[PDB]
Each structure stands twice: as structure tokens, then as C-alpha cells.
Amino acid sequence: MQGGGTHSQWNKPSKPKTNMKHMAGAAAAGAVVGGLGGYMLVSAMSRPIIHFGSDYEDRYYRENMHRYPNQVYYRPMDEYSNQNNFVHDCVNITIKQHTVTTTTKGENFTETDVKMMERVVEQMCITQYERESQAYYQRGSS
């Protein structure tokens, strides 16, 4: 039966979320929830080779590059912080987009799967700070 499964999204059997196949009564901030993680279906920036739980799976990365909507989000900012920790948070926000897709049929994240995104997103998240940093070094006022 389409609509009203035992996952509600991927793995959360405790709430009667979703009643039918299509809905339109929901309206919070657009469509997403909690984390941003992009909002459009386009091409992601140049992503480097990621270290998966195994060098064997990193090969699948380029195979599911289209199945990886874990792209970076956008928002005006200028807060300086640790490139190590500050981005460690963006890693999940960037994963949110990859999570909303799970509802497609009740997808899940295994030990290796999480190693695929958690790494690619962090590594890509740090870039968000390195790109806004150069723009400041070349030009800045008040």
C-alpha cells in the first residue's frame, strides 16, 4: 500500500506520518526539514576521491554520483570558525538531501553507506568555507 508504511521516511515506526501517496497540507519552510543541503536538482562541484570504509566501495562513488544528491547548501554568512569542527556539522546538513530521497521506498544507511556520504560531504563542506575565505582576502570592507 502506497502511503503509510512502517518507516515514515526510512526508519521511524512510532508516528502515523503520511496517509496517502501525495500530499499538500504541509508547509513549514518549503519542503526540506531541519537541515538545508541544497534545494535544486543540478550538478555538484568537482568532488575528490573519498576514503570509504573500503577502497572497493569508493569505486561505486562515481557510479552513483547521480544518486548522490548530498550537495552543499547555500546561505549568506561571514562567521569565522574551525574548519575542522564548523564543517563537521555541515556534513549532515549536506546529507539531508540524500536522506529525503530515502522515502522513495524506505531506504536506509549501512555502515559503509554512511561512510560514503559522511566523508564526501565533510570534505565538500570545508570547501564552502575555503571559497568564501578567498573572496574576502581579495576584497573586503566593513
UniProtKB/Swiss-Prot annotation:
Keywords: Amyloid, Amyloidosis, Cell cycle, Cell membrane, Copper, Disease variant, Disulfide bond, Glycoprotein, Golgi apparatus, GPI-anchor, Growth arrest, Lipoprotein, Membrane, Metal-binding, Prion, Repeat, Signal, Zinc
Membrane topology reported for the UniProt record: Lipid-anchor; GPI-anchor
Subcellular location: Cell membrane; Golgi apparatus
One MF term in the entry's GO annotations: molecular function activator activity
Consequence of substituting G38V: Protective factor against Kuru; protective factor against prion disease; confers protection against classical Creutzfeldt-Jakob disease (CJD) and Kuru in the heterozygous state but can be infected with variant CJD prions resulting from exposure to bovine spongiform encephalopathy prions; confers complete resistance to all prion strains when homozygous; acts as a 'dominant negative' inhibitor of prion conversion; is not only itself resistant to conformational conversion, but also inhibits conversion of wild-type proteins
Function in brief: Its primary physiological function is unclear. May play a role in neuronal development and synaptic plasticity. May be required for neuronal myelin sheath maintenance. May promote myelin homeostasis through acting as an agonist for ADGRG6 receptor. May play a role in iron uptake and iron homeostasis. Soluble oligomers are toxic to cultured neuroblastoma cells and induce apoptosis (in vitro). Association with GPC1 (via its heparan sulfate chains) targets PRNP to lipid rafts. Also provides Cu(2+) or Zn(2+) for the ascorbate-mediated GPC1 deaminase degradation of its heparan sulfate side chains.
Name of the featured protein: Major prion protein
Complete-protein stretch covered: 91 to 231 of 253
